Swiss-Prot record, chains A, B:
Cofactor(s) recorded in Swiss-Prot or TrEMBL: Ca(2+)
One cellular component term from this protein's GO annotations in UniProt: cell surface
Protein name as catalogued: Phospholipase A2
Part of the whole protein covered: 23 to 145 of 145
Reactions performed catalytically: a 1,2-diacyl-sn-glycero-3-phosphocholine + H2O = a 1-acyl-sn-glycero-3-phosphocholine + a fatty acid + H(+); 1,2-ditetradecanoyl-sn-glycero-3-phosphocholine + H2O = 1-tetradecanoyl-sn-glycero-3-phosphocholine + tetradecanoate + H(+); 1,2-dihexadecanoyl-sn-glycero-3-phosphocholine + H2O = 1-hexadecanoyl-sn-glycero-3-phosphocholine + hexadecanoate + H(+); 1-hexadecanoyl-2-(9Z-octadecenoyl)-sn-glycero-3-phosphocholine + H2O = 1-hexadecanoyl-sn-glycero-3-phosphocholine + (9Z)-octadecenoate + H(+)
Length: 123, 123
C-alpha cells in the first residue's frame, strides 16, 4: 500500500518525507504519468508503474478489490534494509518487490529540483 | 498484535497452527496464567507475559487504547528469521521484541502433549 511504500523510501533515504519530496516529480512520479521520463529518478517511477501494471496481469492479484496502493503487505526496515516478508501471499509479495525495487532506485539516482512539480506540458 | 505473534511462531515452526497447538497449554500458554510453569514451553509463556507486563509500565505504551494483542506492529519473516521493523515506534518496538523472543523460545523447547489444555486445578 502507499503507506508501506512511503516507509520503504524513508528506510533507504532517512532524511526525506517521500510524500513531499518525490511527489509530482517528472512525468512519472506521482499520480499518472506519460511521455519520456525526464531523468533517471523519473525512470525509477516509470519502471515502478510497469511493475504495478504487471502485477495486474496476475491471476493471484485478481481477488483484492483494493488497488496496489491499498493492497497492504508486510515488510521490515532494518539497518536501512528492506525485506519483504514471507507471510505475504503471491500478489502482496509481487507489489512488495515492486515497491522495494523503486525505493532502492530512488536512493541510487540524482534528484533534480528543476524537475519538481514539472509542467505537465512536457510529458 | 495477536496476529503478528501467530505469524512469528509459524515463521519459526513452519508446520504448526500456533493458535491451535500452543493455545491452552500449561498454566501460562493461552489467556491468563498462574502457578508454576509445568515445563519449559510453559516457561516461555510466563516470560512472555512478564515482558507484556513490563511493556505496560512504559510511558510510551500509555497512549494506545488497544491491548498488546491489539497493538499491531510490523516485522518480516525471511528464511525463518524474524526481524522487528525500525518503523515501529517505542511501544510497538517493545511488544515486537517480546513476541519475537517468545516465538524463538517456543521453537527451542520440547512440547509435551500431556500438558495440552491442562486441568487448571494444577495452576
Ligand atoms: Ca506515476
Ligand atoms: Ca497466559
Amino acid at each position: 500500500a502507499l503507506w508501506q511504500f512511503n516507509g520503504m523510501i524513508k528506510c533507504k533515504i532517512p532524511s526525506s518525507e517521500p510524500l513531499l519530496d518525490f511527489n509530482n516529480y517528472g512525468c512519472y512520479c506521482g499520480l499518472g504519468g506519460s511521455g519520456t521520463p525526464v531523468d533517471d529518478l523519473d525512470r525509477c517511477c516509470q519502471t515502478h508503474e510497469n511493475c504495478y501494471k504487471q502485477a495486474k496481469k496476475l491471476d493471484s492479484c485478481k481477488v483484492l478489490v483494493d488497488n496496489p496502493y491499498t493492497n497492504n503487505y508486510s515488510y521490515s526496515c532494518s539497518n536501512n534494509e528492506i525485506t519483504c516478508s514471507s507471510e505475504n501471499n503471491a500478489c502482496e509479495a509481487f507489489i512488495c518487490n515492486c515497491d522495494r525495487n523503486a525505493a532502492i532506485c530512488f536512493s541510487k539516482v540524482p534528484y533534480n529540483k528543476e524537475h519538481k512539480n514539472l509542467d505537465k506540458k512536457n510529458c
